[PDB]
DNA sequence: CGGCCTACG
DNA sequence: CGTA
DNA sequence: GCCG
């Protein structure tokens, strides 16, 4: 009944077992700190189902059948039905490991392999990392002078100031370039932790050096606080009444024939991503990435208008952006 | 048993 | 490695 | 962890 692909499927932005996926979500992103990419995914996977089911879990019976439930995530369903907390997952929520990694992951440029290295150094706050500032990456001496700006939820209103900034320096960069957001407010979020923008040129190959050209002009606006191509990872200084706040802003550069491609990767979810590119390849035999859709056999690329083209061409049924909240 | 998205900076 |  |  359930398909097992995450893209085979509506998953909507609000739904009906909240208490379910959370719990799942921490085994997921605990399996994640300890170094197993597949017990993650797994997690990941069964949190997503839940997602798409049409009502409540109430009762372990309608577990049955469900793709990515075994014995452990089974389990964890099981004791929050019966006691309203799993175990394992209180135990994981109160670790000191789980908490100081979840807090050194959180900062923009430390992933899991850099905050498993300072924890085994004994480092267990923002603080500790501050007084040793040798340890650090620019990008990371970044994301952690920024860290209370970056953690306050970015909000629609800051969306609409930051792409009007966008498309005025774009407009300035080159005439007739486009602007178009993406990431999880194209999905429909109210709020995130980041914004993301996806800039093309009808004509082909107009949208050449167009990056840099794009960085320099909000840099001279003074609107840059972190940056350093086609796609740029960046802070942003967002005026704020009386005041500002920093705001992290991806800027990506596709040519017009690969728009549909890039619009289509970057809006997410990363869970329907990696769902709709393992779907394109273990059961079609195609290449998918954010630049096109490659035939290995043939050794073709194929030519999509709209994102719609790309679904049908998978033989999948389209989803709209705001039913890929894997 | 081995696979688990696939790129760019 | 980091980012998505 | 789950699945092909
Ligand atoms: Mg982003
Ligand atoms: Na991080
Ligand atoms: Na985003």
């Known amino acids: 009944w359930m398909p097992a692909y995450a893209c085979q499927r509506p998953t909507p932005l609000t739904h009906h077992n909240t208490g379910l996926s959370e719990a799942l979500e921490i085994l997921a992103e605990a399996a994640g700190f300890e170094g197993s990419e597949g017990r993650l995914l797994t997690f990941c996977r069964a949190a997503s189902v839940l997602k798409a089911l049409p009502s409540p879990v109430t009762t372990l019976s309608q577990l049955?059948?469900?793709?990515?439930?075994?014995?452990?995530?089974?389990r964890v369903v099981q004791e929050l039905l019966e006691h309203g907390v799993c175990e394992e997952v209180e135990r994981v929520r109160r670790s000191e490991r789980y908490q100081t990694m979840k807090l050194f992951t959180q900062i923009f440029g430390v992933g899991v392999k850099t905050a498993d290295r300072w924890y085994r150094e004994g480092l267990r706050t923002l603080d500790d990392l501050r007084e040793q500032p040798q340890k650090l990456t620019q990008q990371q001496k970044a994301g952690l002078q920024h860290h209370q700006d970056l953690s306050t939820p970015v909000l629609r209103s800051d969306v609409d100031a930051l792409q009007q900034v966008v498309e005025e320096a774009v407009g300035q960069a080159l005439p007739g370039a486009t602007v178009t957001l993406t990431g999880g407010f194209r999905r429909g979020k109210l709020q995130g932790h980041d914004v993301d923008f996806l800039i093309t040129h009808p004509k082909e190959g107009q949208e050449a050096g167009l990056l840099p050209r794009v960085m320099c002009r909000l840099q001279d606006q003074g609107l840059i606080l972190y940056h350093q191509f086609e796609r740029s990872f960046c802070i942003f200084r967002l005026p704020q009444p009386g005041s500002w706040k920093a705001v992290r802003v991806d800027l990506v550069v596709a040519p017009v024939s690969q728009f549909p491609f890039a619009?289509?990767?970057?809006?997410?979810s990363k869970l329907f991503q990696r769902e709709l590119r393992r779907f394109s390849r273990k059961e079609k035999?195609?290449?998918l990435n954010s630049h096109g859709l490659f035939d290995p056999e043939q050794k073709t690329f194929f030519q999509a208008a709209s994102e719609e083209d790309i679904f049908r061409h998978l033989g999948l049924e389209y989803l709209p952006p705001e039913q890929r909240n894997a």
């Open 64 to 74: 049955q059948g469900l793709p990515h439930f075994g014995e452990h995530s089974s």
């Open 285 to 287: 035999g195609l290449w």
């Open 263 to 268: 619009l289509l990767g970057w809006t997410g």
